[PDB]
């Protein structure tokens, strides 16, 4: 016998129609529900919404809301990546203008759950 799924605790998001869905949990394996992601967070498909599925191994996707970082404009830096979108965990190099640099001798930035780490700024 397969383990039913309890209410999903979608971190950095939640389920749509929460009020109507909640009284019917735990749900059988095979059941799926439309969910959303909060501001700055995206679904594995790149949208703000998708469907979470109750499988044998539990809720799929396991990480329903991943952070999305939009590369900022650098006042005194090269803007080849200006406005580019990056998924949580991906790394990018910051090319600053001569005489400018990322504080405390840094060059690479990474998209974390909190956002860009460190903050991409030249001097």
């Amino acid at each position: 016998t397969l383990k039913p799924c309890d209410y999903p605790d979608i971190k950095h998001g939640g389920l749509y129609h929460e009020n109507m869905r909640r009284p019917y949990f735990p749900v059988a394996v095979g059941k799926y529900y439309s969910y959303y992601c909060d501001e700055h967070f995206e679904t594995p498909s790149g949208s703000y919404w998708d469907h979470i599925h109750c499988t044998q191994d539990g809720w799929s996707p396991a990480v329903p809301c991943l952070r999305k970082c939009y590369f900022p404009y650098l006042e005194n830096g090269y803007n080849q990546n200006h406005g580019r979108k990056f998924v949580q965990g991906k790394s990018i190099d910051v090319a600053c203008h001569p005489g400018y640099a990322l504080p405390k001798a840094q060059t690479t930035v990474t998209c974390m759950e909190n956002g860009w780490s460190p903050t991409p700024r030249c001097i």
Binding site: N19, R22, P23, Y32, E39, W49
Partner: protein
């Protein structure tokens, strides 16, 4: 009267449902700008939508723009058609996307078509104020992407506190599903809600959620999700009893 819904304020003389709170239609720090018949208004998570000016038992259509504040500037996320279905004690919203933001570049819009159900609101029927017995038959509309011609039939046995229905006449055959027997349960605020399985050719294709609306349980409103050969499809559901 689409323009009045955006410009004119709330008036008690207008036909119900008069107001609709945009919660599932607009996320907390995002903006939804609606435009129709020369009119233009921005919302607003928790902001009210003047449904009173719209026509009952019909789909009201508006042009939408969804935006997010990125570095103190409002950047477009998605755009298309915003649909509103009105009834006397209930109303529901839907989004038909035509353009979305590129996966790799923000500020670059790409043509993608997604249909999703927004809000399902109204004068909720209390689970503790439902009729003790009798059978009620609900008749109304079922609507998906590029189709508002579906006809919904739902039946509730108040003694058993159980419901069952059927969807018919939708262009996509896989969407003409059966709404399996499901128990009416109380909500967190103790509102009468129904949720069960969706079947096509006696196979489970998804779930359906309905809310009972009106003092004397006059209406039902909600949505359904159906698995088809080409993907998961959403259907807006709204039905009423004989007036």
């Amino acid at each position: 009267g689409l323009a009045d819904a955006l410009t004119a304020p709330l008036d008690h003389k207008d036909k119900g449902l008069q107001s609709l709170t945009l919660d599932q239609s607009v996320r907390k720090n995002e903006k939804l700008k609606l435009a129709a018949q020369g009119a233009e208004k921005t919302y607003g998570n928790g902001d009210s939508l003047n449904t009173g000016k719209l026509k009952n038992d019909k789909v009201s259509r508006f042009d939408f723009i969804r935006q997010i504040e990125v570095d103190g500037q409002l950047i477009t996320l998605e755009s298309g058609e915003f649909q509103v279905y009105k009834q006397s004690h209930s109303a529901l919203t839907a989004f038909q996307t035509e353009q979305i933001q590129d996966s790799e570049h923000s500020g670059k819009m790409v043509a993608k078509r997604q249909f999703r159900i927004g809000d399902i609101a109204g004068e909720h029927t209390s689970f503790d104020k439902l009729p003790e017995g009798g059978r009620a038959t609900y008749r109304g509309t079922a609507f998906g992407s590029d189709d508002a011609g579906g006809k919904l039939t739902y039946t509730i046995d108040f003694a058993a506190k159980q419901g069952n229905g059927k969807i018919e006449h939708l262009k996509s055959p896989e969407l003409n599903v059966d709404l399996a027997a499901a128990d009416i349960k109380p909500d967190g605020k103790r509102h009468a809600v129904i949720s069960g399985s969706v079947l096509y050719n006696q196979a489970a294709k998804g779930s359906y959620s309905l809310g009972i609306f009106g003092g004397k349980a006059q209406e039902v409103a909600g949505s359904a999700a159906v698995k088809t050969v080409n993907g998961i499809r959403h259907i807006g559901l709204a039905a009423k009893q004989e007036l």
